[PDB]
């Protein structure tokens, strides 16, 4: 997260870290045994880390659980990044409480201007690289479709939305992928892609979760 702030331990209880010997992507806990992340984060040997704050130190409240199966959306296109969503089933159910909790799926899509919370352990530098130990947070608004398509002509599908600031300075960045975009207590987006990080007129692009509620529910129900 570029231009954000330190969330504070356990303030984003649904945030997960996908680990393979190092943190490579984020994710969101949607129920005791399922995590939602980005399709491009797919790889074998994924360990899901819940209840994390400092990802480099065992501080208490962490639960490390292996991924039982990772379900990438069947229509995911790695070139266009359309349908960039993946479900991960945990080998064992997580212990829910206060420090670890699930986030709700949306009932309707969010409108432009809605304020959301984006979080992650990604790069905090727009130019260069600096990975934080603790979880970073950023409040950002969902941008209008016209502004989003103006910024990325011919690349925005109906399954994506832009959020952020056209003036630059605040944005999600490498390491934040798969992470949550929560608005009004509902998971509305998944960190996906962008042209660089926090660059002027190049806001972040996110997977539009509301278009996948039916798919998520049917898939979970069958697995």
């Amino acid at each position: 997260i570029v231009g954000g702030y330190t969330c504070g331990a356990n303030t984003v209880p649904y945030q997960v870290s996908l680990n393979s010997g190092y943190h490579f992507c984020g994710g969101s806990l949607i129920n005791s045994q399922w995590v939602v992340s980005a399709a491009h984060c797919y790889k074998s040997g994924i360990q899901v880390r819940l209840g994390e704050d400092n990802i480099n130190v065992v501080e208490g409240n962490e639960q490390f659980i292996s991924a039982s199966k990772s379900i990438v959306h069947p229509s995911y296109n790695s070139n266009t990044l359309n349908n960039d969503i993946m479900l991960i089933k945990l080998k064992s159910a997580a212990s829910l409480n206060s420090r670890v909790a699930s986030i709700s799926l949306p009932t309707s899509c969010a409108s432009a201007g809605t304020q959301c919370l984006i979080s992650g352990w990604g790069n905090t530098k727009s130019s260069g690289t600096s990975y934080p130990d603790v979880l970073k947070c950023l409040k950002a608004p969902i941008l209008s479709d016209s502004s989003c398509k103006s910024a990325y002509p011919g690349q925005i599908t109906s399954n994506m939305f832009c959020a952020g600031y056209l003036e630059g300075g605040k944005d999600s960045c490498q390491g934040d992928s798969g992470g949550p975009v929560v608005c009004s207590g509902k998971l509305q987006g998944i960190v996906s892609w962008g042209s660089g990080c926090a660059q002027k007129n190049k806001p972040g692009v996110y997977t539009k979760v509301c278009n996948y509620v039916s798919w998520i529910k049917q898939t979970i129900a069958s697995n």
């Binding site: 491009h40 490498q174 042209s195």
Partner: peptide
């Protein structure tokens, strides 16, 4: 344009 996913490492396209 050159667009990259926000994973570690990033996956870029144009």
């Amino acid at each position: 344009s050159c667009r990259c996913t926000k994973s570690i490492p990033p996956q870029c396209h144009c």
